[PDB]
Write a protein that binds this DNA or RNA. Structure first.
Ligand SMILES: [Zn+2]
Ligand SMILES: [Zn+2]
Ligand SMILES: [Zn+2]
Ligand SMILES: [Zn+2]
Lengths: 71, 74
DNA sequence: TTCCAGAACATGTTCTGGA
DNA sequence: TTCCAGAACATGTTCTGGA
């Protein structure tokens, strides 16, 4: 039911983890190309359905921590 | 200024002649320029607001034109 | 039947040049 | 000082091949 990365509604098991579509799409883009990833506030950003956009670097670390994997 | 003329989200300015949010501004540009084939899946009278503007891009674009938006404007 | 990765499709946010 | 168009950047959602 809940996305392990942002607590939004999970659509299913993506890349090894239960996530929503946004996190599924964000993760793949994160590992492939990227998007500026180095936090300012510094690794303590609250990643939820409403503030996930606020910090791209914290979102990804949480994707990794959650154990999402392409391979 | 105040609310978006199209969806009522907070407007960021006058874009293409009308007071719109940034989402509606980018949406209008794509509606006029891209290859689309819009037709309301319902009765062509959907309520377009912040949480629902994604539900029917056909009526959203109709609202944009209605409200006077036009690529030939500031 | 039921599932998901990725492509295809759709949407939203920041930046700032040249007024 | 302030404004916006569009480029560049960033994000989210549908669809379905091939299991
Ligand atoms: Zn998520
Ligand atoms: Zn952060
Ligand atoms: Zn709007
Ligand atoms: Zn409609």
């Amino acid at each position: 039911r809940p996305c392990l990365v942002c607590s939004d509604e999970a659509s299913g098991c993506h890349y090894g983890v239960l996530t929503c579509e946004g996190c599924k799409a964000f993760f793949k883009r994160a590992v492939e190309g990227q998007h500026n990833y180095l936090c300012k506030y510094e690794g303590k950003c609250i990643i939820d359905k409403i503030r996930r956009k606020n910090c791209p670097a914290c979102r990804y670390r949480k994707c990794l921590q959650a154990g999402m994997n392409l391979e």
